[PDB]
Amino acid sequence: IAFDICGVQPMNSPTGQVFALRAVY
Amino acid sequence: GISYAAQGLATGFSTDTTKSVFAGVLGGKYRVYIDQYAKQDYFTVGYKGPNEMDAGIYYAPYVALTPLRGSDPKNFQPVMGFKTRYGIGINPFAILNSLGKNAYFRRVYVKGI
Amino acid sequence: KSRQLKAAYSIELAQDLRAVHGMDADAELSGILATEIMLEINREVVDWINYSAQVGKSGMTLTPGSKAGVFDFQDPIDIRGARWAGESFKALLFQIDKEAVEIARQTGRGEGNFIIASRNVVNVLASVDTGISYAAQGLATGFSTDTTKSVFAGVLGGKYRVYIDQYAKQDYFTVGYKGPNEMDAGIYYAPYVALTPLRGSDPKNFQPVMGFKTRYGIGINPFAILNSLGKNAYFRRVYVKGI
Amino acid sequence: NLIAFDICGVQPMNSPTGQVFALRAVYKKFPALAASTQTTVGDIYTHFFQETGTVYLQASVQVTIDAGATDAAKLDAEIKKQMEAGALVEIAEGMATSIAELQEGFNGSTDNPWNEMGFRIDKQVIEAKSRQLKAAYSIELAQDLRAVHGMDADAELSGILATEIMLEINREVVDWINYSAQVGKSGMTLTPGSKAGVFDFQDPIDIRGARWAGESFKALLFQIDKEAVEIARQTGRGEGNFIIASRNVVNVLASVDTGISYAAQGLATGFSTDTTKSVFAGVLGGKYRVYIDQYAKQDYFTVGYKGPNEMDAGIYYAPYVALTPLRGSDPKNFQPVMGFKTRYGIGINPFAILNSLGKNAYFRRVYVKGI
């Protein structure tokens, strides 16, 4: 439930990685 | 309806307190949850897009509620427990590069309550 | 007499070995454990040989100008005036022939049939008799396709089957005799139980435990372990120096 | 081209970061040999000589060692005499082994030492590190290679680059091995007159009494074996299985042991039909698969171990992407774009990059002089 306000992209292995749609700044 | 009182709970003399959920929606705008372990008094406002990649924070569960079992012959007592594995992430914003740096969230200490 | 080993391993690692590369995880650990307990038994057999073997390059096997028990590759007496390693290495095999004879004499059963030796010595002995000591070029060809380093290299001079002691302590070789009769070894290993599996967990966190236990017992020619330390006529132990 | 990483665990990735596994290892008190001592055959006694420390001698003979030798000088003379006479025979670590075996056997008990395989078994996270090159060729060159020779122009450039990027990757693999390899000709692999980590072909001590290059070459091989032995000891997995070395060293090996490294004289005879110098030259002693480092900086050899298990290597390489082509042209002058990019990632048994430099149990690096 911890992630109801987070991205999850659950992994099928540790390490494992996620993507983030970061602005260029 | 920012925080659901659950009068039925009170009415029935604490039938099921369900203290594991979002309280409700503040102003019809913010889904709000109680930090049950807050150290003092504060609030944090955050953004979450429909695309999980637009959360600015990630939780990526791999393992959950793996039971532990057995017994410890030294006192011959039962072994029971639980393990999970998940991992977190924060949008880079450049943990060293995340402390007090996250554009998706703002936190304020609150006094006078 | 028994020996026992455990896996004592992490849950998460077992999970990842399977999840990441399709590895059989704990099954592989089991293979390691079976290997390790067998290697330890094997190491023990060698330790007993090197416990009980009589001191070699002694008595009937001494050169008058020798150093009593040590074959020094830099010593002109031991190497019989040899020129370079080529001749010197051969001089060692000659001392081995001398040890083999003393064994023959005392045992009354015939000269030494096999050798147990250190990596240094084996590499030396493998430098003579061309292809006799299995270098395992086929394994090298396949890039250590299956190392199998639990075997005898081969037969030196066509006479001594030579094995490498993976656990060699310093630098030595021991020449020993073995007849076709199981009663003609002078040393015995008589397995009763082998590779009995272990199954359990560490209660602090329920992490798994696997492993193996064996029972085999050992023996000697009576020789009269009170009567074996430095007394076993079937073997002669020589210290090696200078490699 | 060929794969340097044929001697690495591979465990290929399907995602960078991304991980590999490795089989990481866990990591004389004899009463006295002195005046009046009556030794008894087979047992072991300790004597400290006035000169050159101690010896441990095992009796071959039951004998009283000069009960009147209360003067250590007399005693040394008598003990030496008994050794010279063959009554007492010297062994050092083997005695330590023997006393332990005696004590362990005699007092053996089940108690609670269930032992364990001496292995932690571990893992590393590795990124699919990239390497990339541009063909960077001109139109005019292409026009004339086609017009003059009937050549396929950029096709040749493409083949060269693909070869070069793979070669550079192989060069990197070798440098990582040399980086992590422990110093050789050190500790267990030293000789009394040694120069600490270097083999000098002109030095009688290093070359073990060898006559000229012919035998010094073989003496190098002896030092190689010493390194291989040390690797087996420290790894707990096995003898070095392969050699990576400089051109000088490879020529040293090719010049000895009849047929270990090959000239591949068919290629030479045919006028360099394909030099293929990305393949192990052959096998030293029938034991060590040997390869040439095209980029060796000075002169050196490295001995390393590789098991049959992909987890047993010290060095791991897990390819993700290979030879992704480039294409196009820059309109400012329209010169063409072509080339290649790869992604692979490496891992090194942790031995605790920072913890692999000069620390890797699987490899030993020795500097070479005198060739």
Side-chain angles (χ1 to χ4, degrees):
Chain A
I1 65 170
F3 56 85
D4 287 345
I5 56 168
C6 306
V8 294
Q9 301 176 54
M11 305 177 288
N12 61 333
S13 74
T15 65
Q17 65 184 273
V18 300
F19 297 93
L21 308 180
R22 196 204 121 142
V24 72
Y25 296 108
Chain B
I2 87 93
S3 178
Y4 180 61
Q7 185 168 344
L9 176 61
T11 300
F13 293 91
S14 299
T15 58
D16 185 359
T17 61
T18 72
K19 302 298 181 182
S20 61
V21 299
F22 278 73
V25 180
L26 182 67
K29 292 190 281 185
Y30 310 97
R31 187 74 176 173
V32 55
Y33 178 78
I34 296 168
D35 181 2
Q36 294 184 29
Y37 307 99
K39 297 299 187 184
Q40 290 173 298
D41 203 344
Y42 79 107
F43 67 92
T44 300
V45 180
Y47 169 78
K48 171 66 179 66
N51 190 316
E52 292 181 17
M53 293 187 281
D54 197 26
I57 182 165
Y58 308 91
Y59 177 85
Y62 172 58
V63 176
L65 299 176
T66 299
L68 307 179
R69 294 289 186 271
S71 66
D72 212 341
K74 291 188 294 300
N75 59 358
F76 196 81
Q77 298 301 307
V79 176
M80 180 181 282
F82 274 123
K83 183 178 296 196
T84 71
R85 302 179 65 187
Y86 62 95
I88 63 171
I90 306 292
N91 174 308
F93 288 127
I95 64 172
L96 295 174
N97 290 317
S98 64
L99 179 64
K101 296 168 182 176
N102 187 342
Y104 286 65
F105 297 84
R106 301 280 284 181
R107 64 183 179 188
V108 178
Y109 173 58
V110 181
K111 292 175 71 175
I113 293 174
Chain C
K1 300 295 191 185
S2 66
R3 287 301 283 282
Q4 60 190 15
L5 298 175
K6 65 188 178 183
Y9 67 100
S10 297
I11 293 167
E12 299 108 296
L13 182 58
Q15 290 172 342
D16 295 345
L17 287 166
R18 178 102 270 173
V20 175
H21 182 77
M23 292 177 181
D24 291 305
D26 55 296
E28 293 165 352
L29 272 65
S30 181
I32 293 168
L33 288 159
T35 300
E36 288 287 306
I37 199 162
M38 288 186 279
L39 290 170
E40 284 294 318
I41 293 168
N42 186 41
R43 168 233 74 175
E44 180 177 2
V45 170
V46 172
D47 286 345
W48 285 112
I49 291 168
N50 288 331
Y51 174 91
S52 67
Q54 294 177 357
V55 297
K57 187 172 175 76
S58 68
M60 292 302 293
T61 60
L62 296 172
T63 300
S66 68
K67 302 301 189 299
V70 53
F71 186 99
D72 184 346
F73 275 83
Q74 304 305 316
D75 184 334
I77 299 300
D78 286 344
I79 65 172
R80 304 181 71 79
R83 273 63 167 166
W84 164 247
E87 290 185 342
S88 182
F89 289 0
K90 290 177 182 178
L92 177 61
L93 189 58
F94 164 82
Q95 183 67 47
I96 288 167
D97 303 322
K98 287 174 65 69
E99 252 23 85
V101 173
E102 177 60 11
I103 292 167
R105 187 186 73 80
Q106 290 183 48
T107 59
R109 316 295 293 120
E111 67 275 20
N113 300 121
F114 64 92
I115 300 171
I116 299 167
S118 70
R119 310 207 138 102
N120 288 350
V121 172
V122 171
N123 289 338
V124 169
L125 294 173
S127 295
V128 299
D129 293 323
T130 64
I132 267 56
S133 296
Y134 180 71
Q137 186 174 346
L139 277 56
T141 299
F143 294 107
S144 298
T145 188
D146 187 358
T147 59
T148 72
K149 302 297 181 185
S150 60
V151 300
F152 286 69
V155 181
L156 298 170
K159 190 187 294 183
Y160 305 102
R161 187 78 179 176
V162 60
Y163 185 61
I164 179 66
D165 183 2
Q166 296 86 342
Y167 300 96
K169 183 68 173 179
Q170 185 176 13
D171 192 5
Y172 62 93
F173 64 95
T174 301
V175 180
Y177 172 87
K178 173 66 178 70
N181 194 309
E182 293 193 63
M183 294 187 281
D184 193 23
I187 184 166
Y188 306 90
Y189 145 80
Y192 175 53
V193 175
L195 301 177
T196 299
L198 170 67
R199 295 290 184 276
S201 66
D202 184 337
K204 73 183 182 179
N205 60 354
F206 184 68
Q207 76 184 59
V209 179
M210 296 181 79
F212 288 104
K213 184 174 187 187
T214 68
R215 304 184 69 179
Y216 42 96
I218 63 170
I220 60 172
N221 180 272
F223 297 121
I225 64 173
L226 294 172
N227 292 304
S228 65
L229 178 65
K231 298 171 185 178
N232 183 338
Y234 281 75
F235 299 87
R236 301 283 286 183
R237 180 177 182 181
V238 178
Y239 178 66
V240 177
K241 178 178 176 183
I243 297 171
Chain D
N1 206 336
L2 284 83
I3 297 172
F5 63 86
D6 285 341
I7 60 166
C8 301
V10 178
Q11 303 177 47
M13 291 185 283
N14 61 338
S15 175
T17 66
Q19 66 198 288
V20 299
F21 302 94
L23 307 181
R24 205 209 146 142
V26 76
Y27 297 113
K28 277 33 180 171
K29 301 184 181 179
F30 290 99
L33 180 61
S36 85
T37 299
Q38 183 181 37
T39 60
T40 299
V41 63
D43 209 341
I44 301 163
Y45 308 89
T46 300
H47 180 59
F48 187 100
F49 282 101
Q50 290 177 318
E51 301 293 343
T52 69
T54 61
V55 300
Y56 301 90
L57 309 182
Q58 182 168 29
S60 64
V61 175
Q62 183 177 53
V63 61
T64 301
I65 301 171
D66 192 14
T70 61
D71 184 332
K74 287 174 69 176
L75 179 58
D76 288 351
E78 185 67 27
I79 292 169
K80 182 67 161 70
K81 180 177 175 177
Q82 291 296 326
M83 182 172 177
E84 290 172 350
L88 305 173
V89 178
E90 188 178 5
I91 304 171
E93 298 304 323
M95 301 300 211
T97 298
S98 296
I99 198 168
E101 185 66 30
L102 173 60
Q103 291 170 338
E104 291 171 357
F106 180 77
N107 291 315
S109 179
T110 298
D111 297 348
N112 291 268
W114 191 291
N115 287 317
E116 61 185 295
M117 63 183 181
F119 297 103
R120 301 166 153 115
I121 309 300
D122 206 342
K123 62 179 178 175
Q124 295 186 323
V125 180
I126 62 171
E127 77 281 18
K129 183 179 181 184
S130 71
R131 298 286 307 279
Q132 61 281 317
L133 296 170
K134 299 191 285 184
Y137 71 97
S138 67
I139 292 166
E140 294 79 7
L141 177 63
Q143 289 172 341
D144 293 305
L145 289 171
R146 174 104 270 172
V148 176
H149 298 292
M151 286 175 182
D152 291 309
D154 54 292
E156 183 66 14
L157 272 285
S158 182
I160 294 166
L161 192 148
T163 300
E164 229 233 54
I165 196 166
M166 289 186 278
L167 179 59
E168 283 290 316
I169 293 166
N170 286 342
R171 167 215 65 88
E172 180 170 0
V173 171
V174 171
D175 283 342
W176 279 111
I177 291 168
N178 286 337
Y179 172 95
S180 69
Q182 293 180 6
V183 174
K185 185 170 178 175
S186 179
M188 292 301 292
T189 59
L190 296 171
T191 65
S194 66
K195 274 81 196 173
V198 56
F199 184 98
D200 186 339
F201 275 70
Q202 301 301 315
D203 183 335
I205 294 166
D206 286 347
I207 66 175
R208 276 72 170 179
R211 284 83 59 86
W212 76 289
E215 294 173 349
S216 292
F217 284 2
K218 290 178 181 177
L220 182 65
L221 273 56
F222 299 167
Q223 188 65 48
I224 290 167
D225 285 342
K226 290 280 283 181
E227 264 13 270
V229 171
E230 172 58 16
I231 292 166
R233 184 196 64 75
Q234 189 63 48
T235 57
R237 318 282 316 118
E239 298 85 357
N241 297 118
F242 58 81
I243 301 164
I244 302 167
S246 70
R247 280 87 64 204
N248 288 344
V249 171
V250 171
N251 289 332
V252 168
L253 268 59
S255 297
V256 299
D257 201 18
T258 301
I260 62 171
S261 298
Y262 292 85
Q265 65 272 35
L267 299 174
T269 298
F271 297 95
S272 302
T273 61
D274 186 351
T275 61
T276 71
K277 301 294 184 180
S278 298
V279 65
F280 285 68
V283 181
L284 168 65
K287 293 182 175 177
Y288 314 93
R289 186 75 176 272
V290 53
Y291 178 68
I292 178 65
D293 181 5
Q294 294 303 334
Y295 299 98
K297 280 71 178 171
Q298 291 177 291
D299 192 352
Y300 79 105
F301 67 92
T302 299
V303 180
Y305 170 81
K306 174 67 180 72
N309 192 307
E310 293 193 56
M311 291 187 278
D312 188 17
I315 184 71
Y316 303 88
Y317 186 106
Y320 174 59
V321 175
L323 300 177
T324 299
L326 310 177
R327 293 290 186 274
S329 67
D330 185 338
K332 71 187 180 185
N333 59 18
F334 294 98
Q335 295 292 359
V337 175
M338 182 175 74
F340 286 109
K341 178 168 184 176
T342 71
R343 303 181 67 185
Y344 56 92
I346 63 168
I348 304 172
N349 177 312
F351 288 127
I353 303 302
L354 295 173
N355 291 285
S356 66
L357 176 62
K359 296 168 185 175
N360 188 340
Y362 288 72
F363 314 114
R364 298 293 183 281
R365 180 157 58 107
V366 177
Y367 182 70
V368 177
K369 292 177 72 175
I371 296 170

